[PDB]
Assembly symmetry: D2
Homo-oligomer: 32 residues x 4
């Protein structure tokens, strides 16, 4: 089968966590 370096999962998750915090802040804004 075909494989890629797993370290990339780490990076992606980290960023998505931020992009997630951003959205929550964004919606909490308009809610305020």
């Amino acid at each position: 089968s075909y494989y890629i370096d797993a370290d990339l999962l780490r990076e992606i998750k980290q960023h998505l966590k931020q992009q997630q915090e951003g959205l929550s802040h964004l919606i909490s804004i308009i809610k305020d």
Copy 2:
């Protein structure tokens, strides 16, 4: 219904993002050594 709409789309975006994060977390338990 202008802010409602924006707000609704943001909630959907946030759902999709959470879904992707759960997919990644599941992937993170199928790592293989080579």
Copy 3:
């Protein structure tokens, strides 16, 4: 030397593209 199935990275990529489409939509809904 640790790996994951390459298909799993493709799946992520498609979801990221969907996120992008939805994000460009909001931005366009202000336009």
Copy 4:
């Protein structure tokens, strides 16, 4: 529309995300 421009910030986020994934998918290993 600091919101709009707050979204632009995020959409650029995904772009990086996607770009970095694309580069890694040029380095796939077959077993």
